[PDB]
Each structure stands twice: as structure tokens, then as C-alpha cells.
Design a protein around this ligand. Structure first.
Ligand SMILES: *C/C=C1/C(=C/c2[nH]c(/C=C3[NH+]=C(/C=C4\NC(=O)C(C=C)=C4C)C(C)=C\3CCC(=O)O)c(CCC(=O)O)c2C)NC(=O)[C@H]1C
Ligand SMILES: *C/C=C1/C(=C/c2[nH]c(/C=C3[NH+]=C(/C=C4\NC(=O)C(C=C)=C4C)C(C)=C\3CCC(=O)O)c(CCC(=O)O)c2C)NC(=O)[C@H]1C
Lengths: 313, 315
């Protein structure tokens, strides 16, 4: 099972109880964006991130009463249709708001039971994706496919180090390709134990396919209230990209000298086959539209991995 | 009975009838559709060899000036990028795309691929979260039918086509419409089946390799390449990879009988075989710009993956 989270007086995590940390319910978010939760029917804002005032430019209490209908007039009917009751928590709807306080915000929404989870992040506003897609497809074998994928992602993102990390049958890991800035250690061909990505994280990653930590030294921002009013229980934030990262993981990134990190799932036959893995030596918020490109690439790689593995077997 | 290609018409090949269908050489028509222009160039020197007859009017230069310059001089910013992206020996399926600002012609989309020692250059005029939203909706579709319906409706919304269908292949190459989204007033084709000679065998071979093809005007006359044969080989120029390549006169007559002015389609390739087609009809001529066509290419790949996934959930 899982331990209770800290804020419900659960035990603090060690290297003895890795598999029992409730990574999906930390009740907080990374501070480069803002999150609201809201009732599926009324559009009533139930929780907000204590930083919401910044991004939204709204007097704190104003929000926690108001309705999405009021708050987002053009958007609220779209949400209603895009995310019908009973849909999966994996389904997401996005829009760009030209919002008074902040030039442009990206809005990402999904639904968990009766709750809508809304994420706001700064945003903005060519052929590299089309060119990459054809390059992946003409790679003659799995090895070359791995090389093209990591190089392509590095070129699109500027990440110092981009790896393709593959999963063995006992969840043991291997770096099979890597493109990196001059003057980093080379991790190509190294293997890592099966606890370095624990059992509960490998399930979330079969389902939600992108996650990132934009700054491995930044403090999480609590949800207020922390518990969902509807349930008097923790909000599942597993589908949220601004979800706060486990403190056990941020400690590991700093021991490596990493300031920013991102990864995309490669899912084949309903199982987690590998990850496109990205390091950055300093903090780095990749904007939503560039993340989308890596989400597409994740699907394309999932297709090509199967194609390529079939022409060996 | 499978039979090897006839020589094309311009090399004295016989004209094509319901009797000799499977033997037309569709990949070497020696002409293109008139809404874009095409050049061929030597893959090492960049010497310009062939051009479509309409090239002067897209590129704003006399044919003889064009032919007198290398791509290094014509495309100084793109020539080195081309050479890196399309190395000798690469497959004919690999494409490189760029946008050019051309003086006379506005923004042109440039699409390049390599066939042996020949570079093929296609030029066409070019012009929010709909794709991302569609990707997630496709993945959340509960079964094959719902996937097919979401896919057809999405493509129709993105493109404005009169009719968008998911065409599915049977083992005998007979086909069937398993879903469609159509303009009000059109007669449904949902659930109709059609014989195996409605897409002959040399065309199914080609659609496993090149994944998107189109006819913007089913009454427009093709534009010849000049000269018609590749001067490197004194042989036909393979335009299998070229989306601007002219369409077989056989197939353009069928569309006119159907009252279609414009057609487009994307392959769904599963396990190395042609699983089906995302097919779009329009009653009048209709050019879909290159960047919108890219969205359909991406959806073709997504749908190939999701079809595998939905079918595996089915035994
Ligand atoms: C006792 C618990 C420990 C633990 C927990 C933990 N780890 C993750 C996630 C990841 N761990 C990864 C491991 C590696 N990263 C690398 O760069 C390399 C090799 C060069 C390895 C072997 C990776 C890649 C992830 C993915 C996450 C990401 O994209 O940033 C979590 C999950 C956190 C979450 O927010 O869901 C947890 C709880 N890691 C340990 O090493 C032990 C001590
Ligand atoms: C003896 C020659 C014939 C012939 C030739 C032919 N057909 C194609 C390609 C296609 N034919 C299609 C047939 C259909 N169109 C529809 O709308 C429906 C049903 C709703 C069917 C069954 C289709 C879909 C294609 C693919 C391309 C497209 O969608 O437009 C070719 C290939 C052309 C080329 O690659 O240049 C050829 C030569 N078809 C016949 O029926 C006989 C008379």
C-alpha cells in the first residue's frame, strides 16, 4: 500500500521504505506555475496554490469563492464538453489565455472524479518536428533510432544532456544512447538498479507520459486547503505537470549537479519500455509548447521502437 | 495476376484500360500538379537538371537562368542544411522541409528528398492546441469504433473537407468504410464494401512507403517536367516520393464521375502493412497548405499506434 503523506502525519521516507511514498498526493506544486481545483458541476474554485495571486493578479479571497463560468467565460463550456464526467484522468484539454495581468498563459485541465484540475503557466505567441519525424522513421535499426532521438531532443530543447534510458525485464536500467554538452561525464552504457525508479512511480508513468522538475532547489508551494473539500481527502495531483516533486528525488538531482530535469515515457505493448531523459546543469522552465513537441516525439518513438524491434525479432 | 510495369506513355507505352490496370507506372508520370513547382538537381554538384514547365512563374526566373546556376547559388542558406539532412545513400522516404521567403512569390514551403544521385525539390505557397487536444482524445477513445469516429471528426474539423472516412483493408485487399464524418446532404458511405481492384497492387506497395498523397483539382492538366527524362540516366525521374507528382489519368476520371473536385488521404500502416486510409473528399477543388498537411501526417502516425493498441485489446 502507501503511507499517508507527511501533512497527514505519515512517516518520513528513507531508503528502506521507497515503495510506500504517496508521490501523487503531495498537496503542493512547483512555483513556476499556479494550480486551481474546481467542482465539476458548479465550476466552484475549491483549492488554490498559495502563489495564485502572482500569476492570476487576483486578490486572494476573490478566487476561492468565484466560479470558472465567471473566471473563464469563453473556456468554461469547452471544458465541460472536452472533459465529460467519467472521462479518464489521462485526458487533457489545453488553451492559451490572453489574460490581463500576464501577457499569455497556457491552461491545462484534466478531470479526476468530480474535480477539475487547472494548471496555469506562462507561454508565448517550426519544421524541426516534421524533419525529426522522418529522421526517426528512416533510422535503420534500434541503436541508430536511439541516437537520432537523443540528438533531436537535445537540438530542440538545448538540454545539456539528453539520454534514452531503457528498462530491462527486472526494471533494471540502461543508457543506450546519449547526446550531451562537452564537459559532462558520459553515462552511456551504464546500468542502474531497479529501485532507482520505484514500483509506484513506474505505474504513474505508464499512464501520464511527461514529467519535469524545473529547479532542483526550489521549495514547493502548498495547496490551500490542502485537503479537497469534496472528500476531506488529498487531491490526486498525479496528472498535474506542476505537481510538487518528491523531496527524495530533488536530493538526488543536487548530488548530481543538476538544476533542471525532464522526461518522456516510451510505452510499448501497454508497458513502460524506456524514457527520453533530459538533464540541465541550471534551473530551466521549458515552455508548454516545446513540451508538447516532446510529448509528440514520445508517441512517435513508441511506434518506431516496436517497428524496429520487430525487424530484429 | 501481377505483371511488371508498362513503360510510361512518353516512352511509347500503351494507354491504360480496365484490362491492364496493375501495370501503369504511377511513380514515373514525368509531370506534376499545377499548384506547385518542382526542380531536380545533381546530389553532389547541385546542378539543376529538370524543372516543371511552370517553374518560372513560381520562382520568378527564366528557365534558362535557373538551369544555369547550382543550388549553392540559388539556395545559399539551405544548400548546406540539405546536404547534412539528406546524405548519400539515405532512403527516398526521408524528407527535409524548410520555409523560404522568396521575393516574387511570398513564403514558399520547400520539401526535399533524395533518390539515388538526384535531389527532388518541391515548392508550394504556404500560409492552436487542436492537435494536442486530438492526441489525448484519440488515446482515451474506448474502442476501435470510437477511435475511428473521433479520428474522422477531428480531421474534418481541422480541414473543412466535405467528407472524411476511415477506410479499412480486408485480407483480400477488399475495403470497407468503418467510419465517416460528412457534410449535411451527402449520402452515407458508412458500411459499404468495395472490390480489390479499386486500389491496385502497385499502389498499395507505394502507400506502405510514402504516407500522404493528394489531388487538389481533379480536372487540372498535369505540368510536364522539362526535360522529361533525367539527363543523368536518360531514364524516367522517380516521383514516388514527390507529393506534387501528377495523378494517373485513370484515377482522375473516377473522381469526376463521383463529383469530387479535390482528394487527400493518409495511410495507417500497422506491422509494416497498409491497414487502412484516412480518406477526404471535396466536391470542389481545394488546396490544403503544407503546414496543415503536416498535422494530418502526424495524425496518421498517432492513428497507426492507436489502432495497434485498440486491436490488441481484442482477441
Ligand atoms: C528510496 C527512493 C529513491 C528514489 C526515488 C524516486 N525516484 C524517482 C524518479 C526517478 N529516478 C530516476 C533515476 C535516475 N535518473 C538519472 O538521471 C539516472 C541515471 C543517470 C537514474 C538511474 C529517474 C530518471 C526518475 C524519473 C523522474 C524525472 O523525470 O525527473 C521518483 C519519483 C518522483 C515523482 O515526482 O514522481 C522517486 C520517488 N530514487 C533513488 O535513487 C532512491 C534513493
Ligand atoms: C483500372 C484502374 C482503376 C483504379 C485505379 C487507381 N486507384 C488508385 C487509388 C485509389 N483508389 C481509391 C478508390 C476509392 N476511392 C473512394 O472514395 C472509395 C470509396 C469510398 C474507393 C474504394 C482510393 C481511396 C485510392 C487512393 C488514393 C485516393 O484516396 O485518392 C490509384 C493510384 C493513383 C496514384 O497513386 O497515382 C490508381 C491507379 N481504380 C479503379 O477503381 C479502377 C477503375
Amino acid at each position: 500500500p502507501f503511507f499517508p503523506p507527511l501533512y497527514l502525519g505519515g512517516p518520513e521516507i528513507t531508503t528502506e521504505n521507497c515503495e510506500r511514498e504517496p508521490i501523487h498526493i503531495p498537496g503542493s506544486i512547483q512555483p513556476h506555475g499556479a494550480l486551481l481545483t474546481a467542482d465539476g458541476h458548479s465550476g466552484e474554485v475549491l483549492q488554490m496554490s498559495l502563489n495564485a495571486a502572482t500569476f492570476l493578479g487576483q486578490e486572494p479571497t476573490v478566487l476561492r469563492g468565484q466560479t470558472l463560468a465567471a473566471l473563464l467565460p469563453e473556456q468554461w463550456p469547452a471544458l465541460q464538453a472536452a472533459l465529460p464526467p467519467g472521462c479518464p484522468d489521462a485526458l487533457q484539454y489545453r488553451a492559451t489565455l490572453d489574460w490581463p495581468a500576464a501577457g499569455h498563459l497556457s491552461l491545462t485541465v484534466h478531470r479526476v472524479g468530480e474535480l477539475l484540475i487547472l494548471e496555469f503557466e506562462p507561454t508565448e505567441a517550426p519544421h524541426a518536428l516534421r524533419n525529426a519525424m522522418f529522421a526517426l522513421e528512416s533510422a535503420p535499426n534500434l541503436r541508430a533510432l536511439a541516437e537520432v532521438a537523443t540528438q533531436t531532443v537535445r537540438e530542440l530543447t538545448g538540454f545539456d544532456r539528453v539520454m534514452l534510458y531503457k528498462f530491462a525485464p527486472d526494471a533494471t536500467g540502461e543508457v543506450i544512447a546519449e547526446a550531451r554538452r562537452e564537459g559532462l561525464h558520459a553515462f552511456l552504457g551504464h546500468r542502474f538498479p531497479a529501485s532507482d525508479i520505484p514500483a509506484q512511480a513506474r505505474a504513474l508513468y505508464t499512464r501520464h507520459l511527461l514529467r519535469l522538475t524545473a529547479d532542483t532547489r526550489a521549495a514547493a508551494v502548498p495547496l490551500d486547503p490542502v485537503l479537497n473539500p469534496q472528500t476531506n481527502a488529498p487531491t490526486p495531483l498525479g496528472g498535474a505537470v506542476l505537481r510538487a516533486t518528491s523531496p527524495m528525488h530533488m536530493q538526488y538531482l543536487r548530488n548530481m549537479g543538476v538544476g533542471s530535469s525532464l522526461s518522456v515515457s516510451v510505452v510499448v505493448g501497454g508497458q513502460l519500455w524506456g524514457l527520453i531523459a533530459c538533464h540541465h546543469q541550471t534551473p530551466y522552465v521549458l515552455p508548454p509548447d516545446l513540451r508538447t513537441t516532446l510529448e509528440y516525439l514520445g508517441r512517435l518513438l513508441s511506434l518506431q521502437v516496436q517497428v524496429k524491434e520487430a525487424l530484429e525479432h
